[PDB]
Design a protein around this ligand. Sequence first.
Ligand SMILES: Cc1cc(NCc2cccnc2)nc(N)n1
Ligand SMILES: Cc1cc(NCc2cccnc2)nc(N)n1
Ligand SMILES: Cc1cc(NCc2cccnc2)nc(N)n1
Ligand SMILES: Cc1cc(NCc2cccnc2)nc(N)n1
Length: 330
Amino acid sequence: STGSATTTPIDSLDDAYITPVQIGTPAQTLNLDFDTGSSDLWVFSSETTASEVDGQTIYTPSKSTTAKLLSGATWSISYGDGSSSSGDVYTDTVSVGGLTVTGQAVESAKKVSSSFTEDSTIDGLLGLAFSTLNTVSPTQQKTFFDNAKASLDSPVFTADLGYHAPGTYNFGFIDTTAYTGSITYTAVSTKQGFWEWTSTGYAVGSGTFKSTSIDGIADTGTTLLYLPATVVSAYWAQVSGAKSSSSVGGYVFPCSATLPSFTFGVGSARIVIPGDYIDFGPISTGSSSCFGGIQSSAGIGINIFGDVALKAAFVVFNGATTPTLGFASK
Ligand SMILES: Cc1cc(NCc2cccnc2)nc(N)n1
Ligand SMILES: Cc1cc(NCc2cccnc2)nc(N)n1
Ligand SMILES: Cc1cc(NCc2cccnc2)nc(N)n1
Ligand SMILES: Cc1cc(NCc2cccnc2)nc(N)n1
């Protein structure tokens, strides 16, 4: 089997992306944030504290003839930024782009932090990291991809995120019309539960390529590109007036600037992020200070190839017995 679903940015600046997912019988369609950096499928629901729901579409398990309580199971997750959610668990039928999994753990939120409440366009998350990170207790649950894997034509999914435009998540096949040239595959470590790999270096604009190993994760769930402070300083040094500011907690550049591209290495291949992709717009309405899309990872503990980087490529998440990642230009 295969599936194919369109993923759509939530606003004009690609702050996050949403993909429609069918849950239950009859289907209840919720727009979920597909997140290769986490491993829980959780939704706003009829159980969510009412004051913490503000415009989201909710899953109501009592209206699904295929829903079943997973007795005794609870979940709780903290993301790196202070965003949190928790609740109980049902199993139900879940379909993405025509690919159906029965008995999928659907984690129903009883509580969500304010950032989730305020994101009216995001009805939940669908995790696509490794199932070892799933937070359900006392019985850890599998991701949608792990449950679908054996049925798929090939044990892969692909992320093709758009710049200021919709893109595609495919399951079970590689669309050879969706990229140019060849896909370069690179080794993955699953030791931390992430799609963790090692970039071979970087270049700033038309500058020379610096060969250096950069370990990081491919995370569709992270909006920005987070890299070592040395690399980030070298990038922003090429933008007149750019600076790291403590009020905004990161690098800002003049909204009159033209940004240089940023290239990252995948083996001997190179992925070029156009300068415009590194532009996230004014820090507040009417400001002439604009938010940079490349930021330091120094406070995180890991480098993160988030959407800024991934949207410049066609990305293969290869879930074979020994997982690998593939990147192609497009
Ligand atoms: C899921 C998610 C991410 C996101 N990232 C961008 C962002 C903007 C401002 C401050 N911090 C982050 N914006 C939203 N709306 N939801
Ligand atoms: C995948 C994901 C979503 C999310 N949503 C909360 C949120 C909303 C707005 C701005 N920043 C965060 N937070 C995180 N860390 N990961
Ligand atoms: C995405 C974005 C928005 C922006 N807004 C500033 C602005 C205000 C008024 C007229 N022209 C520009 N400036 C830049 N560099 N990128
Ligand atoms: C205007 C704005 C602020 C912001 N703040 C959160 C933040 C600070 C430092 C690094 N990463 C995230 N994030 C985004 N995307 N836009």
